[PDB]
Amino acid sequence: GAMGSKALKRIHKELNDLARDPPAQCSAGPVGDDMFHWQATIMGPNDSPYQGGVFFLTIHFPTDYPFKPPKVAFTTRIYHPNINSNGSIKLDILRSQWSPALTISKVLLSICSLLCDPNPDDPLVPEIARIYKTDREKYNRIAREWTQKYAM
Amino acid sequence: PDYLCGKISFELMREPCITPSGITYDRKDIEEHLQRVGHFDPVTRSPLTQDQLIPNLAMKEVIDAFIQE
Amino acid sequence: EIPDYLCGKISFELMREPCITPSGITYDRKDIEEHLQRVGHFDPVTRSPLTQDQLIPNLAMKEVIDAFIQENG
Ligand SMILES: [Cl-]
Ligand SMILES: [Cl-]
């Protein structure tokens, strides 16, 4: 109806803007004939312990989009204070700080920022957040080991 | 009253949603169904997608008056 | 006395065959079908383009209305 068509035109518009000006290290788009269900790819950022890894995510837009945030999760395992073993992302933009002015492009930028700079003081996985805050050499070691075991 | 209840949740609905078949579901349930069971209507089995879901605004007003009881 | 969500946006009477538009708006069938033929192909409330074939039976409302009858008139 009205609402679903509105969501579709906006998802469509955001897809077009993204393919016309892709990020160098990322990508996102519908898996098949389903514009509400996307896959994304994030290259592990250089200058971080996810270096060299490839991380895949699923994105599900709601019928209320853009007035509700997309649902975004990792399908590649990753060692991170704000990402758990289910792939769930504790990130403000996806919860209380959503705005209909934001986009998937901005969601991807924010997740990359999150990988470069965890939020251990508001953890999703408290033990990883503790190792991050107390022993960054060990956090970096384990994060690189997970990158090699699961994303390379 | 069975009609305040969802056709999946089997509970009173907070966000009533109607399909082209004319069946009303609570939003979360129908969307989870569409995304992770299949793109079809659970009661009529006809094809259904997320963008065809229509807010059942009349039914929401019904639940609101029943809540105030 | 009747509640408003039971009465038609056009009809101003108890609805007998409720249809809901792609905007989520519910009308009595005869009245919305008469609006579409005499006024134009648009939703009386949201104004977005509307045709008769896009009307959907609001089946839950039909049983809400039937339960009101079974209590009073
Ligand atoms: Cl339901
Ligand atoms: Cl009416």
UniProtKB/Swiss-Prot annotation, chain A:
Stored InterPro entries: UBQ-conjugat_E2_core (IPR000608), UBQ-conjugating_AS (IPR023313), UBQ-conjugating_enzyme/RWD (IPR016135)
UBC core domain residues: 6-152
Catalytic activity reported: S-ubiquitinyl-[E1 ubiquitin-activating enzyme]-L-cysteine + [E2 ubiquitin-conjugating enzyme]-L-cysteine = [E1 ubiquitin-activating enzyme]-L-cysteine + S-ubiquitinyl-[E2 ubiquitin-conjugating enzyme]-L-cysteine; S-ubiquitinyl-[E1 ubiquitin-activating enzyme]-L-cysteine + [acceptor protein]-L-lysine = [E1 ubiquitin-activating enzyme]-L-cysteine + N(6)-monoubiquitinyl-[acceptor protein]-L-lysine
Result of changing R95A: Abolishes histone H3 ubiquitination and decreases interaction with PHF7
Top-level taxon: Eukaryota
Family label: Belongs to the ubiquitin-conjugating enzyme family.
UniProt-recorded name of the protein: Ubiquitin-conjugating enzyme E2 D2
Organism of origin: Homo sapiens
Recorded name of the encoding gene: UBE2D2
